[PDB]
């Protein structure tokens, strides 16, 4: 009854509305504002400690809330827990599947999550059982390899897979609490907010989409990049974030503006982004490449603040600690490297 | 002070776990990993593994195991959306998502009382009324038709043959977007890539899966992170591509114009009883694949074309000899001797 035609016309008018809304809200840029600020201190960090031990390629990690413990997973099928101070690995735990792709350390230091090609989020009671860590939960699968799972508390987690669908779970009951099905590609990177009330997911749709743990819907959307988004991380304020994809550039997206801000790239680079992080303040943006090297950028002048090199293989992950003291990095040569 | 003993205990735990991890590295360095993709059934990897080896048990074990989880999932999902069933339901709630527990014999006694209560997945009423059929059993067709188990993530099988450990794995239940999960395979020793020919095609759909196989092989061979691993290429459906060729019944010439002026190589070894008109076509496909294999070869990864034989006992021998050749060529490239 010609209802689809009117629905499509209304949808097209709606889609055109956002263009004019963003054009009205884009009166200036950040370069015109950051001209007066003086340049960044040129920083080249040094490798303070190297953490040997893994037999094969590592893939992810997560700084503990105590700025001391690290959890690293390698292709050998074993997660080891570090002590960044003494460089003294506290213990290792094998896996059921040899292929793991993401880790997660609890904000309280009690549980540890593991995900990979097994399509199973395995949670482990790090401190319970009065002994060796045991398998606490094996969250149900959803036809997609886990690319990123993170803890917002000890009672529930949030995972993302390659089925273009994220899932906020409930560890106690071990079932899907909220399903997020608003993607056309592999959902890869997650990053919770300071208030843990919402997050933004970066997938292979060349787009970062903000979700909400309460209603389970998409409030905003960002379609700036050109290739598959690999990493994403919030500015430490909950009003903006940074995305890194295979187009060899990192971009800053604000929430209240709903628009791109700055792009970070050079001409003599082609390697895609593998991991993006900030500092404690948020002025330095840490981006790992595939040229066996990573770069620290300025999050306000788009200038290369410096380089961090020392891996003979492609870097896989990087993360800053709570007090912004150290920058851990990790490459496929079984090597983690702490910087400061 | 008292921190010294704590530091020394931490160091002792380190020494123990490192003594374990050295041997774990020794073990991992001696297992060759093989990747199987292409087929739409993981069981194709469980048959060849059943010809020698925990897989020697009957296939009824796995099917009966996929029947003890449906009832648990249904009873856990039905009661989660809601007289003396508190301590009886607490144990069931604590037995949720327990991998090594499965179903004890005392669970039916606690579940029958909850099922008898008048107040209390899609297919959940058939596998819940006959909760008294537990034994040791022998499922029927109507029960297997209603059972809907989730897609098994990765079929992983570590076996040991001829005093060497092999780790063969099939990747199923995943999406057809093969972009970001192939990267996870670099330490693999070989990718066994199986190809099929045309099917019955009778109402011809005309999908031309062969050219898509060429394109996927070109994308995998010329990958940046797969430049050191080798591909053992098998050509299945050798019997279906034999009686369907004849003299003009196969549409292989319409899909490849170069097949007309193509000739059978002199160094070929046709099976005793193979016609020239089918031998030429059987070698044309391997020549087309080697046209991509012989190019971009930096002496760093090669290909091993082999026809799928009828006897399932010699495909394993082909794989073993190919693994030996892979290790040999890697070692020769190590010392700059090749």
């Amino acid at each position: 009854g010609s209802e689809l035609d009117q629905l499509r016309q209304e949808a097209e008018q709606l889609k055109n509305q956002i263009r004019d809304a963003r054009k009205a809200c884009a009166d200036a840029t950040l370069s015109q504002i950051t001209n007066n600020i003086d340049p960044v201190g040129r920083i080249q960090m040094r490798t303070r400690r190297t953490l040997r031990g893994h037999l094969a390629k590592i893939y992810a990690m997560h700084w503990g809330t105590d700025s001391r413990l690290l959890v690293s997973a390698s292709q050998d099928g074993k997660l080891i827990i570090w002590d960044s101070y003494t460089t003294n690995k506290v213990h290792a735990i094998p896996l059921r599947s040899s292929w793991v792709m993401t880790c997660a350390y609890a904000p309280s230091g009690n549980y540890v999550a593991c995900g990979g090609l097994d399509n199973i989020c395995s949670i482990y009671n790090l401190k319970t059982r009065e002994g060796n860590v045991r398998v606490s939960r094996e969250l149900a699968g959803h036809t997609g390899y886990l690319s990123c799972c993170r803890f917002l508390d000890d009672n529930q987690i949030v995972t993302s897979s390659g089925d273009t669908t994220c899932a906020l779970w409930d560890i106690e009951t071990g079932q899907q609490t909220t399903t997020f099905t608003g993607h056309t590609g592999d959902v890869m990177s997650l990053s919770l907010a300071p208030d843990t009330r919402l997050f933004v997911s970066g997938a292979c749709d060349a787009s970062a989409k903000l979700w909400d743990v309460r209603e389970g819907m998409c409030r905003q959307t960002f379609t700036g990049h050109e290739s598959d988004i690999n990493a994403i991380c919030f500015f430490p304020n909950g009003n903006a974030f940074a995305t890194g994809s295979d187009d060899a550039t990192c971009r800053l997206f604000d929430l209240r503006a709903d628009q791109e801000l700055m792009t970070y790239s050079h001409d003599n680079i082609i390697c895609g982004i593998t991991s993006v992080s900030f500092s404690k303040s948020g002025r330095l943006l840490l981006a790992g490449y595939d040229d066996f090297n990573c770069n620290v950028w300025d999050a306000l002048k788009a200038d290369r603040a410096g380089v961090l090199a020392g891996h003979d293989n492609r870097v896989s992950c990087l993360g800053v600690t709570d007090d912004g003291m150290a920058v851990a990095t990790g490459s496929w040569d079984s090597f983690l490297k702490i910087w400061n | 002070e008292d921190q010294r003993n704590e530091e020394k205990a931490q160091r002792e735990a380190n020494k123990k776990i490192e003594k374990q991890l050295q041997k774990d590295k020794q073990v991992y360095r001696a297992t060759h990993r093989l990747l199987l993709l292409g087929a739409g059934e993981s069981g194709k990897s469980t048959i060849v593994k059943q010809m020698r080896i925990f897989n020697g048990d009957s296939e009824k074990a796995t099917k009966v195991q996929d029947i003890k989880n449906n009832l648990k999932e249904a009873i856990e999902t039905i009661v989660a959306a809601m007289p003396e069933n508190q301590f009886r339901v607490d144990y069931i709630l604590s037995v949720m998502n327990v991998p090594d527990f499965d179903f004890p014999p005392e669970f039916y006694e606690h579940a029958k009382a909850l099922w008898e209560d008048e107040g209390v997945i899609d297919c959940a009423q058939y596998f819940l009324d006959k909760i008294d059929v537990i034994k040791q059993y022998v499922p029927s067709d109507q029960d297997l038709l209603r059972c809907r188990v989730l897609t098994s993530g990765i079929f992983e099988t570590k076996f040991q043959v001829d005093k060497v450990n092999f780790h063969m794995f099939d990747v199923g239940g995943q999406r057809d977007e093969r972009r970001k999960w192939i990267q996870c395979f670099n330490d693999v020793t070989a990718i066994i890539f199986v190809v099929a020919s045309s099917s019955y095609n009778m109402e011809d759909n005309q999908t031309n899966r062969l050219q898509e196989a060429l394109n996927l092989f070109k994308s995998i061979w010329n990958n940046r992170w797969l430049r050191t691993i080798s591909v053992i290429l098998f050509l299945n459906k050798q019997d279906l591509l034999a009686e369907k060729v004849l003299a003009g019944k196969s549409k292989i010439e319409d899909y490849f114009p170069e097949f007309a002026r193509y000739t059978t190589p002199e160094d070929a070894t046709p099976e005793p009883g193979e016609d020239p008109r089918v031998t030429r076509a059987k070698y044309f496909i391997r020549d087309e694949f080697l046209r991509i294999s012989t190019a971009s070869g930096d002496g760093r990864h090669y290909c091993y074309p082999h026809f799928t034989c009828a006897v399932d006992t010699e495909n394993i021998r082909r794989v073993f000899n190919d693994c030996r050749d892979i290790i040999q060529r890697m070692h020769l490239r190590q010392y700059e001797l090749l």
Partner: nanobody
Amino acid sequence: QVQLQESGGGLVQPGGSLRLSCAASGFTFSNYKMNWVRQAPGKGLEWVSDISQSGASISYTGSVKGRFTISRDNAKNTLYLQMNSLKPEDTAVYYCARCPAPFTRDCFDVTSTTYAYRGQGTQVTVSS
């Protein structure tokens, strides 16, 4: 966003010719290996052609080898495919897909209709 709009298509008697075009935006069109992808009604997706980042490798499908002519202009950010000697077996919907990896020779565009770097294609049939 990264949009890929296809033009052309329509009804034409068997044996005729027809040219169709793909206009892409939102990215640097010059440095991406591109290609097309057909889909026959009631059949899986199928491959036809390919363009390098400069025009070097022009791979065709043997079913259309030496018959269709593909080209592209990096200045105008456009890519054209011209079908000569159209057959009654080519009645299908054609999509303009692109490889995701910049500066690479690996591609994974044929999918189960979830690939994002591929716009809505144009319909082409034959007469009787």
